[PDB]
Design a binder for these strands. Sequence first.
RNA 1: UCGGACU
Length: 191
Amino acid sequence: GAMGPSSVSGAAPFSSFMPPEQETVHVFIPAQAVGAIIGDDGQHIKQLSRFASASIKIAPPETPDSKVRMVVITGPPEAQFKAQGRIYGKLKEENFFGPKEEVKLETHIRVPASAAGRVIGKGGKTVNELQNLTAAEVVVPRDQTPDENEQVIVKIIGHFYASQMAQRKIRDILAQVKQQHQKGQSGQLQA
RNA sequence: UCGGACU
C-alpha cells in the first residue's frame, strides 16, 4: 500500500529494498522472554535489525510450538554473533531465568543431511567434548530426517560463549567435509 | 580416521 507515482526519474534508481539471502539461523526464546524483546514499544526487536546488521523477523503464534517464538536472524556471522549473544544476555538481564537459572536457548543452524552424522563427531563425540568442556550441548536429528535439498537442522543448547564456539566448530568441520567431498573421491573407495 | 549418538 505505497501508491507513490515515482514521477521523479533520476539516473540513479536508489532501491531502498534489500533481499535477505544472508545466513539465516532460527533460535527460539520462551514466550515470556519474547515480551521483553518485542515489548519495548514493539520496535526494540526491529532495532536489532540495524544494530546486529541483519534482517530480523519474529515469529507470531503460527506454529504449534507457540510456547516459544522462533526468531529469524538473517545476516552474516556479524549478525549471528551479535544478535544471538544480545538476546541471550537479554534473557539474563531481564531477571527472568538468569540469576536463579541459566538461559538455555536452542539455535538451529543449517547442516547438509549428508554431513549430519559428521558434525556430531565420530559417534556423538562433539556432544561429549563441547558439553563437558565448553558447556555446549549439541543435538542432531534422529539419523538425519533430511529435506529434499539434503538439509537437516542441528541444535545448540548452552550459553553465548559455548554456542558461538560450537556453531563455529560445527560449520568448520561441516564446510571442510563438503570440500573434501568435492575435491577428492566424492565418497567412494575406488582407488 | 567419514557414521549416529545424546536427548
